[PDB]
Amino acid sequence: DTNVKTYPVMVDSRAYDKNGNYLGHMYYAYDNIDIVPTVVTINGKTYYKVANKDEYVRVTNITGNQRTLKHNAYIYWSSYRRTPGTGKMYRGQTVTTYGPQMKFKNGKKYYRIEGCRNNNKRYIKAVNFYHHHHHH
Ligand SMILES: [Ca+2]
Ligand SMILES: [Zn+2]
Ligand SMILES: [Zn+2]
Ligand SMILES: [Zn+2]
């Protein structure tokens, strides 16, 4: 494989055959992974092929998703704690999120965002990417 990019795994990625069957192992955040940077669709979902393996990992977990804030957002380490020293992001700013929504112990859903590491945890509440806040 001659076309290869390196990216941190931002979310523990299940490894899948070309048919979208789980192979029983994972790639782990925040290790680097080598991928062929060509999007591959399998049963409606996007993957990258791991370099020199007939293995596929979800794009969302690697290069993630461009999302636009619909509301001012604080950056959270956990349910009740802001990432230390962080400010806010504003309605209209663009954020890279990785992976599906994650349910914290408060019961609310979060997106892991660019820069999140074990010593620098960075999440935004999912609702801040939706128009309707009928919950305030
Ligand atoms: Ca807010
Ligand atoms: Zn609002
Ligand atoms: Zn409001
Ligand atoms: Zn609101």
Author numbering: 370 to 505
Paper text:
S-layer proteins (SLPs) are self-assembling, crystalline proteins coating the cell surfaces of many prokaryotes. We determined the atomic resolution structures of all functional domains (I-III from N- to C-termini) present in the three S-layer proteins SlpA_ac, SlpX_ac, and SlpA_amy. The Lactobacillus S-layers are anchored to the cell wall through interaction with teichoic acids (TA), either lipoteichoic acid (LTA) or wall teichoic acid (WTA).
The full-length SlpX_ac shows differences in structure and domain arrangement compared to the SlpA architecture. SlpX_ac_III is structurally highly conserved compared to SlpA_ac_III and SlpA_amy_III, whereas the sequence is less conserved (37 to 41% identity, 52 to 56% similarity). The crystal structures of the TAB domains (SlpA_ac_III, SlpA_amy_III, and SlpX_ac_III) reveal high structural similarities. The general structure of the TAB domain consists of two cell wall binding motifs (SlpA_motif) which are connected by a short linker and arranged as an internal homodimer. Mapping of the surface charges indicates a large, highly positively charged region within the interface of the two motifs that extends to the C-terminal part of the protein. The TAB domain (SlpX_ac_III) would still face inward and anchor the S-layer to the cell wall analogously to the SlpA-only layer.
